[PDB]
C-alpha positions as a Python dict, from the first residue, in 0.01 Angstrom:
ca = {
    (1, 'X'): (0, 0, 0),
    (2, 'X'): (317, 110, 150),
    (3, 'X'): (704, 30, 113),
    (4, 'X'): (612, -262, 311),
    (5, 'X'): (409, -464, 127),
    (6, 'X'): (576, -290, -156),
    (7, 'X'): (853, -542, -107),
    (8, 'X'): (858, -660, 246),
    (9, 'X'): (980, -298, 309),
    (10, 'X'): (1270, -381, 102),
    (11, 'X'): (1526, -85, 121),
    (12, 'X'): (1708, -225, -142),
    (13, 'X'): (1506, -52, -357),
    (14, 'X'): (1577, 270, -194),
    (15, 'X'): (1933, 249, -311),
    (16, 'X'): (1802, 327, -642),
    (17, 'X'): (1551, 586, -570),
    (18, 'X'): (1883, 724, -391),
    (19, 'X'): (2084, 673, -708),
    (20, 'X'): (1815, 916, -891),
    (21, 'X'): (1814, 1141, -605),
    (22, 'X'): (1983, 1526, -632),
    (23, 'X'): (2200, 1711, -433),
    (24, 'X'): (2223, 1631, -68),
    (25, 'X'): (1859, 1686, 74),
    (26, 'X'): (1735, 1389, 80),
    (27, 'X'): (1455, 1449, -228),
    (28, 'X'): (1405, 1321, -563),
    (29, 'X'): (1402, 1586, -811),
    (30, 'X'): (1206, 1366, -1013),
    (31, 'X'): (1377, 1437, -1288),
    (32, 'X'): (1670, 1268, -1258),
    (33, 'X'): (1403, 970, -1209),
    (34, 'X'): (1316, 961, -1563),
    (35, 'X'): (1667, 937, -1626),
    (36, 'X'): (1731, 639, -1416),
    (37, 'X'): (1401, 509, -1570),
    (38, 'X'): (1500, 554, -1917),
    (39, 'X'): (1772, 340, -1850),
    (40, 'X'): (1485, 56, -1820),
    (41, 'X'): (1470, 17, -2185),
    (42, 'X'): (1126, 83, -2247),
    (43, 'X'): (1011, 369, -2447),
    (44, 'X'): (922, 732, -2344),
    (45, 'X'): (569, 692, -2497),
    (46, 'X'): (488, 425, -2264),
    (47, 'X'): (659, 576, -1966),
    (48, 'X'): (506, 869, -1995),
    (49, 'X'): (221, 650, -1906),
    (50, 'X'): (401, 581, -1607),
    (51, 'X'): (484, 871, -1513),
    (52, 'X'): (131, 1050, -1562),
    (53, 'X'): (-18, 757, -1351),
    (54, 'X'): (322, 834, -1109),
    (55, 'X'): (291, 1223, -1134),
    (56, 'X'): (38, 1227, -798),
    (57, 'X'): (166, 1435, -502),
    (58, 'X'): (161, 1706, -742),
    (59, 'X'): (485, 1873, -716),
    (60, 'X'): (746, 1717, -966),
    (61, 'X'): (944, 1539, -688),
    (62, 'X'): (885, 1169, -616),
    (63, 'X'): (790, 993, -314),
    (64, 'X'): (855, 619, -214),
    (65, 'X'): (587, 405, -331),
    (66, 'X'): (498, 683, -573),
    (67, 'X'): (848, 610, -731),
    (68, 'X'): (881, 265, -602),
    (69, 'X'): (538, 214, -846),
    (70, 'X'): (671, 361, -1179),
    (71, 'X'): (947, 133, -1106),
    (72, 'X'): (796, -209, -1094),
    (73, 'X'): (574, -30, -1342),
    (74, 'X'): (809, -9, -1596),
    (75, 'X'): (836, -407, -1569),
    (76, 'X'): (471, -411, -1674),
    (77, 'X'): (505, -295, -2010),
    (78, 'X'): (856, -446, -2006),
    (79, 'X'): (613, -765, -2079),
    (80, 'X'): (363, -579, -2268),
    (81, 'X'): (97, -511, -1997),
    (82, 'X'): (-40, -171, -1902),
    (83, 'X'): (119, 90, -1777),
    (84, 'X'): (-178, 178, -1539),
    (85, 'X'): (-140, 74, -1210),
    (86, 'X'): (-531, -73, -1250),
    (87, 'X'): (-342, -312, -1427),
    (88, 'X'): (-73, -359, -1164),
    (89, 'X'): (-19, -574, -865),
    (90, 'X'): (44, -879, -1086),
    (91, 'X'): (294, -1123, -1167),
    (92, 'X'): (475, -915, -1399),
    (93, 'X'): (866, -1020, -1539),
    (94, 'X'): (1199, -868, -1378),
    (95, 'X'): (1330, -478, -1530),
    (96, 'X'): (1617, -445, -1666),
    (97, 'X'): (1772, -204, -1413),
    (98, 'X'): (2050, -389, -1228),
    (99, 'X'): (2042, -635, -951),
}
């Protein structure tokens, strides 16, 4: 879906993919994604799962549900699920990135 249903289009979350977010364009590097992910807590095995099911658009650079996936995402396997997103869309436990 989009946003939206992502979260009752919940910009909240955009704060974050803002936080990841370099220079002053207005894109996500992507890079600096993985950086705010890793401070999830999960490992880099299982992200890179997440990120190769994130990885989509094609160019390095993130998107919003693109990156507002691999984010929940990382909550999935956070609880030992799958880091596919065939396996997402569930009632998966809170990440450990802040409030």
């Amino acid at each position: 879906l989009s946003l939206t249903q992502l979260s009752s289009g919940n910009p909240v979350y955009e704060k974050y993919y803002r936080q990841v977010e370099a220079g002053n364009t207005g894109r996500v590097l992507a890079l600096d994604a993985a950086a705010f992910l890793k401070k999830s807590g999960l490992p880099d095995l299982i992200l890179g799962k997440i990120w190769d099911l994130a990885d989509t658009d094609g160019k390095g650079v993130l998107s919003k549900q693109e990156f507002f996936v691999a984010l929940r995402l990382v909550a999935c396997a956070q609880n030992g699920l799958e880091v596919s997103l065939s396996s997402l869309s569930l009632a998966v436990p809170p990440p450990r990135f802040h409030d």
